[PDB]
Design a binder for these strands. Structure first.
Length: 167
RNA sequence: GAGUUUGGCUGGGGCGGCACGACUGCUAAAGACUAACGCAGACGUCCUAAGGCGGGCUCAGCGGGGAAGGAAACCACGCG
């Protein structure tokens, strides 16, 4: 039963500097300085005039981090929300997330050349043995006795931060 | 002023159309062949990759999530 502990699988952060160009590289230096890795850009699938986007250009930037590096990034962003989350943000399969409004609450000092950006945090939990569906030889399906669920993920949250479940 | 020519198919001929070379499905009666100015369409091009080969991946769509974000922006999990 040490093979049944829940843990942070992967953490995702991304900013939508809507129309590409000069506003991108301001954000692209934020994610690098906050985490420490170069981020990745994203293209638009189709062209929309009501939003003002073409079919091939940048819209957003994101980055995926793991390990113990992601465990402490998750601690700093939660304190900005007083260590409390809405109860309806948890999903069927052990995932939850939230959005940070203003860039300068977590860290990085102002530098008025950049601006203030919003973030988006998403978290994925899991137990060991998840590799059996990601590998190459003998790819398979996990099994229900593993497979973190919603209420299994709530009570993981009130044990590592002493949070509170609104609503 | 001289010599000569001014196609064919066709429910008569002419006007119109091309069933005049040629591809796909049906008419066609469970091997192949099989008619009508029968039905529904397409051809006289286009491509230095839209050709050849190695490697890595999964598509249309649905379900639960995420600051401004809405019917439609992007991230991402579970199925397909």
């Amino acid at each position: 039963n040490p093979m049944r502990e829940i843990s942070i699988k992967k953490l995702s952060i991304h900013i939508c500097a809507r129309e590409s160009g000069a506003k991108l590289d301001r954000a692209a230096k934020v994610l690098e300085q906050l985490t420490g890795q170069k981020p990745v850009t994203s293209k638009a699938r189709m062209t929309i005039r009501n939003f003002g986007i073409r079919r091939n250009e940048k819209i957003a930037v994101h980055v995926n981090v793991s390990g113990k590096k992601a465990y402490e990034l998750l601690n700093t962003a939660l304190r900005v929300k007083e260590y409390e989350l809405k109860e309806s943000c948890f999903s069927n399969n052990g995932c939850f997330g939230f959005g940070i409004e203003e860039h300068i609450d977590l860290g990085l000092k102002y530098d008025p050349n950049i601006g203030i950006f919003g973030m988006d945090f998403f978290v994925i939990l899991a137990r060991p043995g998840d590799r059996v569906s990601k590998r190459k030889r003998c790819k398979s399906r996990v099994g229900n006795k593993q497979r973190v669920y919603a209420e299994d993920a709530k009570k993981w949250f009130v044990e590592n931060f002493e949070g509170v479940l609104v609503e």
